[PDB]
């Protein structure tokens, strides 16, 4: 066989330890899922520093806690705009997930609160910016560098999927690189806690699994497809399926054909053919052996999964250190709080 007794016993013991970890993680998650935290700070606890972005119903501001001096990324959502845009359930769900999960590679919700006009999610601030800019600047990551980030996503999805959470928006744009060089997953706006199938057309075109496009119901295996896309893009510098327009991208995704740069290792190509597998009965992450088909693949043979989880592996890249006040530029607008409560009933749970 492939393994002698010692290797076989080591792998068995490792897999049993994962089970015990996930059982504890689920009990912790469910307590917070069933009794969410609410109203854990207020706006005048913070100084506003800079608007970092804006959206159709909200914006993100760099803020500083007045007493501790800690910096945070505060999402401000206008309740009336959330209602007008029909985003009540998504906003409530995103905050409920964020306050319940706990994992070293997930952005943390440190505080949340609401007032007459707005909802506030006070997030950990990662000044090194996202993987997207680093990847486009460097061009591509070497396979060891890509593997270091991929391993963190594998563990994060192992965690999230054990909680029946599907993430549904993996892409470099949603991955920050912290000051130790480790990944922080952000933006749980499309995440959903469901145990079977679901049907929503959501995600980003280049990262959509075929079964999302084909209007099948789909399951957590779409995240493993998206991991394939991410690894390919990290290692190549461009994604496996692209075109001028999304419809042409979808044709390529469902075709069952992917081509690889000549510098991809054989091991990498094998892993990607098993993740970018249109046939769900064959896709890694979706088989009898679950995540282990991925974690035990030859491309990950040098990966010490526990050392990654414990953050003891030396990162391949440390973003340039600047200072949490350092920080594209946006116009500054006031935070108007009405003297009348808006949309109170709709957001009772927040």
């Amino acid at each position: 066989g492939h393994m002698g007794n010692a290797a076989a016993a080591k792998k068995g013991s490792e897999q049993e330890s994962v089970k015990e970890f996930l059982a504890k993680a689920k009990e912790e998650f469910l307590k917070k899922w069933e009794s969410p935290s609410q109203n854990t700070a207020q706006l005048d606890h913070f100084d506003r520093i800079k608007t970092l972005g804006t959206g159709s119903f909200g914006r993100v501001m760099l803020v500083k806690h007045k007493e501790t001096g800690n910096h945070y990324a505060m999402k401000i959502l206008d309740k009336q705009k959330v209602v007008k845009l029909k985003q009540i359930e998504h906003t409530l769900n995103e905050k409920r997930i964020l306050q319940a999960v706990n994992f070293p590679f997930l952005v943390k919700l440190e505080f949340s609160f609401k007032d007459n006009s707005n909802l506030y999610m006070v997030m950990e601030y990662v000044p090194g910016g996202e993987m997207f800019s680093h990847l486009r600047r460097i061009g591509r990551f070497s396979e060891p560098h890509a593997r270091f980030y991929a391993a963190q996503i594998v563990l994060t999805f192992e965690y999230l999927h054990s909680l029946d959470l599907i993430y549904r928006d993996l892409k470099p744009e949603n991955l920050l690189i912290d000051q130790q060089g480790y990944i922080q997953v952000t933006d749980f706006g499309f995440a959903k806690r469901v145990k079977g199938r679901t049907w929503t057309l959501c995600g980003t075109p280049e990262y959509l699994a075929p079964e999302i496009i084909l209007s099948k119901g789909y399951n957590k295996a779409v995240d493993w497809w998206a991991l394939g896309v991410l690894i390919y893009e990290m290692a190549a510098g461009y994604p496996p399926f692209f075109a001028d327009q999304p419809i042409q991208i979808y044709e390529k995704i469902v075709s069952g054909k992917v081509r690889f740069p000549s510098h991809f290792s054989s091991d990498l190509k094998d892993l990607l053919r098993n993740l970018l597998q249109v046939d769900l009965t064959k896709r890694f992450g979706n088989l009898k052996n679950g995540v282990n088909d991925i974690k035990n693949h030859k491309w990950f043979a040098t990966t010490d999964w526990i050392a990654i989880y414990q953050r003891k592996v030396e990162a391949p890249f440390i973003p340039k250190f600047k200072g949490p006040g350092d920080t594209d530029d946006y116009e500054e607008e006031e935070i108007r709080v009405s003297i009348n409560e808006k949309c109170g009933k709709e957001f009772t749970e927040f």
Binding site: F132, E173, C202, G203, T204, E206, G237, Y238, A243, P261
Partner: peptide, 18 residues
């Protein structure tokens, strides 16, 4: 080349969700 095709695609920047 594939890389040139990627540049020509107009989808080298941040990608929005659908």
């Amino acid at each position: 080349t594939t890389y040139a095709d990627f540049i020509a695609s107009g989808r080298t920047g941040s990608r929005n969700a659908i």
